[PDB]
């Protein structure tokens, strides 16, 4: 009989709050179970919209002024840790497989709308421990934002490392560790990942033999190639 | 030494399950989600925690005598998965197909957590032609190949006889006979090599199966 | 040896164990003769398994370290773990008549495999001789090895260096470098790491400052 901060019952969540000023706003979820929110700090906010499916989702807030927003009609599992003033945003109609992990440290991790994130995907925006230049003696591995654009397919067993942007329509191959930006409409793979194909776009339906066979693919295709013009180095 | 190790879930018509006398086998499953599919397992095969799923029609999976298998085989839309004689396959094995073929030869040593991914699972298109460009492609593992642990072999790849795939590899291009390859993506790291199963073999002649294949490979 | 269950299957095997701290659920198997396991004072062993296969193996874990995982010392191998080194769950050491050493003050993350032996022989087809004999692994003092890493045979990693998440290391890594990839490559030179997340300068962390001074 757990309730969110506005007194709305959320039978799929357990909430533990060790700080002050924290807010959990939760819509009418679908097919959800075994979720947890842990506030280990103050003035944090978790927003989960109507028609989101959360299954075995754990959201942990470390420190203060963190913000996590999960947009409507998405499907999510895994562990999201928002640390020391980080923002984590997951867009509409995005699906995320089991084994998902987000790691932050006063930085931002964003996933656009209409993404397909496979199982065991790690978005690691912080290294966890400091690395320094031996001559300047200053830290050189500060956390850096990860930005996954709308309509990206991230394959199974992939890590995306700090400071990486992945452009719209792109595909990250199984097993990749991505350490550098991937432009729009490209396929990348490897450890470290490299661009392996340019001028591509993906679709969810296995039935589609042409771009026009899938509504969403066609929509993004028109947006990225006709209404706009992309040409990379 | 073990009868009745398979459960059958048949949701179609014309499906065939032909099983020889298995050994040391348990907890196996075959599921037919389609029609006119066939699973044949020969005598003296060991299957443990093997799940074979058929999707669509006209698929064919055959496991030859004296092999040992675990894991998950999914044969989709008229695919053929064939495993040769005396081949051993570790836990965590995965096969993925789509109207294509995946073959493993005789006398192979396939370690744990090996994925043979002949199909990408979702389509990718060229933005200019608008046509799909990632159609499934056959995977062919020749006889007497050692595939190390935690390896994926991707679509369209052939691995030649006597070769070795290193731990943790993702193999995206053909590997010729008698080579060692490793990496992600994998590259050839050594040529003119062959492997053996027993760890006290100091010379090729110390192991009969190694000696046999070495002879065939260096003569042909 | 309260936190240890010992299965001794040979002659002349010795287990010397100091006053452990916070230790539990450990196991040792002596599957051979004349093996030695030595664990110093104030070591934390939790779900550690040490297996000795064959004879004349030696495993020593030095004081004030923390260890988990599985160590297999085979056919006259030596495995040494230095002082004040921390090792995460999923650790594995594989040997065959060779040496694996981790130095002092190391930070070894979860799921790190030190594989000094291939497990099966590979031969040159022309000489017919084996060409993948086991080769020693040396991790120097003050190294951070990231999560889900394998270090393969014959590799040395220099002091102060960092191995990135998910790496497979197949060649030596010099001192004060960061390496990552499969196979791993050097990605940055002239670096050093610290454990404390707060440190913004090398001088913010005692241990970091100490090695930085001695290494430069
Ligand atoms: Cl439910
Ligand atoms: Cl937003």
Numbering used by the authors:
A (entry chain A): 19 to 251
B (entry chain B): 26 to 245
C (entry chain C): 28 to 243
Paper text:
O-acetylation of the E. coli K1 capsule is catalyzed by the acetyl-CoA dependent sialate O-acetyltransferase NeuO, an enzyme that is highly specific for α2,8-linked polySia with a minimum chain length of 14 residues. Beyond the variable poly-ψ-domain, NeuO is characterized by the presence of imperfect tandem repeats of the hexapeptide motif [LIV]-[GAED]-X2-[STAV]-X, a hallmark of the hexapeptide repeat family of acyltransferases. The crystal structures of several members of this family reveal that three hexapeptides fold into one coil of a left-handed parallel β-helix (LβH), which resembles a triangular prism. In this study, we have solved the structure of the prophage-encoded O-acetyltransferase NeuO responsible for phase-variable capsule modification of the neuroinvasive pathogen E. coli K1.
In the present study, we crystallized NeuO using a protein variant with four N-terminal RLKTQDS heptads. Protein expressed from the engineered sequence yielded crystals that belong to space group P21. The homotrimeric enzyme shares typical features of the LβH-family of acyltransferases combined with an unusual funnel-shaped outline. The predominant part of the NeuO monomer folds into an LβH-domain. However, in contrast to the canonical LβH fold, which resembles an equilateral triangular prism, the LβH domain of NeuO displays a more extended outline. Moreover, the parallel arrangement of the individual monomers is lost and the monomers are arranged with a notable inclination of 45° and 34° between each chain in NeuO and OatWY, respectively. Despite close intersubunit interactions at the bottom of the trimer, a tunnel can be observed between each subunit. However, since the poly-ψ-domain is not visible in the electron density of the crystal structure it can be concluded that it is disordered in the apo-enzyme. Albeit the structure of the first 18 residues could not be solved for the apo-enzyme, the overall outline of NeuO with the N-termini of the three subunits pointing almost 65 Å away from each other, exclude the formation of a triple coiled-coil. The structural data show that both residues are located in the proposed active site in positions highly conserved among acetyltransferases of the LβH family (MAT, GAT, VatD, PaXAT, and OatWY).
